[PDB]
Each structure stands twice: as C-alpha cells, then as structure tokens.
Design a protein around this motif. Structure first.
Motif, short mmCIF file in Angstrom:
data_model
loop_
_atom_site.label_atom_id
_atom_site.label_comp_id
_atom_site.label_asym_id
_atom_site.label_seq_id
_atom_site.Cartn_x
_atom_site.Cartn_y
_atom_site.Cartn_z
N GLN A 69 -1.17 74.21 109.00
CA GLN A 69 -1.74 73.03 109.66
C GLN A 69 -1.13 71.69 109.26
OE1 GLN A 69 -5.71 75.70 109.60
NE2 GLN A 69 -5.41 73.93 108.26
N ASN A 70 0.10 71.42 109.69
CA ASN A 70 0.82 70.16 109.41
C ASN A 70 2.22 70.23 109.96
OD1 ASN A 70 0.05 67.57 108.17
ND2 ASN A 70 -1.15 68.96 106.88
N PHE A 71 3.13 69.34 109.58
CA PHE A 71 4.41 69.33 110.28
C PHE A 71 5.70 68.84 109.67
CE2 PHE A 71 4.99 64.79 110.27
CZ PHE A 71 3.85 64.46 109.58
N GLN A 72 6.87 69.26 110.17
CA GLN A 72 8.15 68.64 109.73
C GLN A 72 9.36 68.81 110.62
OE1 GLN A 72 9.37 66.07 108.72
NE2 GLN A 72 9.72 66.20 106.52
N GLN A 73 10.16 67.74 110.84
CA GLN A 73 11.42 67.80 111.64
C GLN A 73 12.28 66.56 111.39
OE1 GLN A 73 11.28 68.43 115.94
NE2 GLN A 73 10.50 70.51 115.61
N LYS A 74 13.36 66.35 112.15
CA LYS A 74 14.32 65.23 111.88
C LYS A 74 14.35 63.99 112.75
CE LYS A 74 17.97 63.41 112.71
NZ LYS A 74 17.67 62.23 111.86
N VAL A 75 13.87 64.07 113.98
CA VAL A 75 13.95 62.92 114.82
C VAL A 75 12.63 62.28 114.65
CG1 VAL A 75 15.71 63.24 116.52
CG2 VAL A 75 13.70 64.71 116.49
N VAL A 76 11.93 62.67 113.61
CA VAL A 76 10.64 62.14 113.32
C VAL A 76 10.87 60.84 112.65
CG1 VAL A 76 9.78 64.42 112.83
CG2 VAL A 76 10.97 63.15 111.07
N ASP A 77 11.87 60.16 113.14
CA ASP A 77 12.25 58.96 112.46
C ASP A 77 11.44 57.75 112.77
OD1 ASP A 77 14.16 60.36 111.05
OD2 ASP A 77 15.81 59.82 112.38
N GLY A 78 10.22 57.95 113.22
CA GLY A 78 9.40 56.78 113.41
C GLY A 78 9.30 56.26 112.01
N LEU A 79 9.42 54.96 111.84
CA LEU A 79 9.40 54.38 110.51
C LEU A 79 10.59 54.86 109.66
CD1 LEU A 79 5.59 54.62 109.81
CD2 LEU A 79 6.84 52.60 110.61
N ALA A 80 10.39 55.34 108.41
CA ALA A 80 11.53 55.71 107.48
C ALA A 80 11.75 57.16 107.03
CB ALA A 80 11.59 54.76 106.27
N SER A 81 13.01 57.55 106.91
CA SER A 81 13.37 58.89 106.41
C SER A 81 13.06 59.14 104.94
CB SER A 81 14.85 59.11 106.63
N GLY A 82 13.28 58.17 104.04
CA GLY A 82 13.01 58.22 102.56
C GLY A 82 14.18 57.92 101.66
N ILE A 83 14.32 56.67 101.22
CA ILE A 83 15.33 56.31 100.21
C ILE A 83 16.79 56.69 100.36
N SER A 84 17.41 57.22 99.30
CA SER A 84 18.84 57.50 99.34
C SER A 84 19.05 58.54 100.38
CB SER A 84 19.29 57.92 98.00
N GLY A 85 20.23 58.66 100.95
CA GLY A 85 20.36 59.54 102.11
C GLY A 85 21.48 60.48 102.42
N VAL A 86 21.28 61.32 103.43
CA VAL A 86 22.34 62.17 103.94
C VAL A 86 21.86 62.35 105.38
N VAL A 87 22.72 62.61 106.37
CA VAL A 87 22.23 62.88 107.72
C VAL A 87 22.19 64.38 107.97
N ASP A 88 21.04 64.96 108.35
CA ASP A 88 20.94 66.42 108.52
C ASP A 88 20.59 66.99 109.90
N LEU A 89 20.19 68.26 109.99
CA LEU A 89 20.01 68.91 111.32
C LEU A 89 18.67 69.10 112.04
N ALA A 90 18.45 70.26 112.65
CA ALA A 90 17.23 70.53 113.40
C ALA A 90 17.08 69.45 114.40
CB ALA A 90 16.02 70.56 112.49
N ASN A 91 18.18 69.03 115.00
CA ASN A 91 18.14 67.92 115.93
C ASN A 91 17.19 68.10 117.09
#
Lengths: 40, 50, 50
Positions: free
Chosen positions: A18-40
């Motif tokens: 009961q909850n969620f996760q993906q990548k274009v969920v970019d409403g607001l911020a991804s989280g600090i230091s970065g890398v660009v990833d998949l599950a587009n």
C-alpha cells in the motif's frame, strides 16, 4: 489463516503493497546528490 | 526473524460422535408415594440410554 | 486458571492451566524522535560563531 507463518516479511510486504515508487514522479524534488536513472 | 508463535487460545480435537465415554442409564419416575424416593419407569422408555 | 487460592501444593492445584504473556516490543522511536530537545522552552540548541 496463513498457510505460511512467517509473519515478518508478510507484514512488510503488505505495507509495501500500500504505497508507491517511480521516476517521473518528479513533482517537487528527486533528493540531493544525483544520477539520472530508469523506469521511464 | 522469529517473532514466536501466536497460540494464546488452545486448540482441541474431538471424537467424531461428540462423546464416547458414556454410561448406560435408566429413566426413573418421581414416585408420588412419599419419602421422595424415585422408582423405575416401566412405561414406554428404554432402560438403556447413552 | 488458579483453581484454589490455598498456598502450596495440593490435589486441587493439579489442574491449573497456563497462558503465555502478551508480547511487548520496546525500542527507540522512529527517526529517534524525542532523543533531542526540540521546541522546548528550557533546553534549546545553540549554533553560534565564537
């Protein structure tokens, strides 16, 4: 009536269910230091 | 990871008939005659009961 | 189920049953909530230049 009593992962899994996760969920911020990833 | 086992209630198994170790008993009459000492029922009631 | 309040071993006490104690987990708060004084009038953190 679990045919299988493990209890643990079970509850955890239900929580996951009961909850969620993906990548274009970019409403607001991804989280600090970065890398660009998949599950587009 | 072992949270133990939930067995607060006890779980039981029973014979198919519901009861086994049953005696054989005979119905008795209140015996209207005083002393309040019952007597056997000779009427239509089998003397063998489980 | 303690059949009789009488102390010591007894014929009646033979039938006592048992039942496991309820579980009780104890650990630190999620995110270590409360370990630091936050939004309290008395104990307030300070981060200043010398």
């Amino acid at each position: 009536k679990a045919w299988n009593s493990s209890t643990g992962q079970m509850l955890r899994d239900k929580l996951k269910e009961q909850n969620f996760q993906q990548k274009v969920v970019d409403g607001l911020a991804s989280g600090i230091s970065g890398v660009v990833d998949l599950a587009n | 990871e072992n949270h133990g086992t939930e067995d607060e209630l006890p779980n039981y198994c029973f014979p198919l008939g519901g009861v086994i170790n049953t005696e054989t008993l005979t119905k008795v009459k209140p015996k209207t005659g005083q002393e309040n000492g019952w007597e056997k029922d000779a009427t239509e009631f089998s003397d063998k009961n489980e | 189920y303690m059949p009789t309040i009488k102390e010591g071993n007894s014929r009646e006490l033979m039938g006592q049953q048992s039942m496991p104690n309820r579980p009780n987990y104890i650990a630190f708060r999620d995110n270590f909530i409360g370990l630091m004084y936050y939004n309290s009038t008395g104990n307030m953190g300070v981060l200043a230049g010398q």
